[PDB]
Structures are given as structure tokens and as C-alpha cells.
């Protein structure tokens, strides 16, 4: 039974770490849709100016 | 996305384990048990606790109390054979 236990202790703090680790992680690519349209002006600049 | 919550709620693992019967038993059953006794053998205390001691622990299955026994009967019946001549 404290085998069982021990293991419940470590657990109860960690799984906040991840679960914060999560929505940080989540967050970047909030910001990744800034830089997803910088990728697609780049791509048409550069194609309007190839067929020049 | 976020990592969800059901591991952070434990009431299942801490109920649900089958040990916990065991263990609501044996706080009971050793916590409450005095680790030693009073004494093995004290019936008859009048110096015949002596003869509990000495015959009737279960430090000895000798033989004497049977012979003592014995030899009472014999005196018994034989003190009465010299009662009745």
C-alpha cells in the first residue's frame, strides 16, 4: 500500500508543471500564426516577381 | 492542447485499492495489542499455582501431576481399605 502511495505524492505537484508546460507551449503557436502569414507574403512577393 | 485534469483527482487509486481493508484491520488489531501478557500460568494461586507452574505449563507434558494424580487415588482407596478392616 505505500508503494501505491509514494507514487500518488510525486505525481500530485509534477502534473501542474506539465499541465502549465502545456498552454506555454500552446502559446507559441499564437504567435506562430503572426510569422505563418510573414511566409505567405514572402511566397507571393516573390512569385509575382519571378513571372516579371 | 492543455493536458487534461482527471490525473490531478485521486480518490480512486486511495479507495480503490484493496489493501485499504487490510489496513483498517490491522490499525485496529496492532495498535491496540500489548505487545506482552501478564503471566502463562497463575490458576489455583495458593502455592498451587506452583503446581500449575511446575506441571500444567505448556513448558512441560512431564509426567509428574499424572503420577501425583495417580498416587492420590491410591492413597485414597488404600487409606479406606485400613478405614474398612
Known sequence: ?????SQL???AETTKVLFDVSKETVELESEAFE???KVELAH???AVLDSW | VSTLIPPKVVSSKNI?????????????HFYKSLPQGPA????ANTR????KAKY????????????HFALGIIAFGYSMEYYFH
Open chain 1, 1 to 5: 500500500r505505500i508503494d501505491s502511495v
Open chain 1, 9 to 11: 505524492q510525486n505525481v
Open chain 1, 35 to 37: 510569422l505563418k502569414q
Open chain 1, 44 to 46: 507571393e512577393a516573390k
Open chain 2, 16 to 28: 480503490g485499492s484493496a489493501p485499504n481493508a487490510k489496513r483498517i484491520a490491522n490499525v485496529v
Open chain 2, 40 to 43: 502463562p500460568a497463575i490458576k
Open chain 2, 48 to 51: 498451587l499455582a506452583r503446581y
Open chain 2, 56 to 67: 500444567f505449563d505448556g513448558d512441560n507434558a512431564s509426567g509428574k501431576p499424572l503420577w
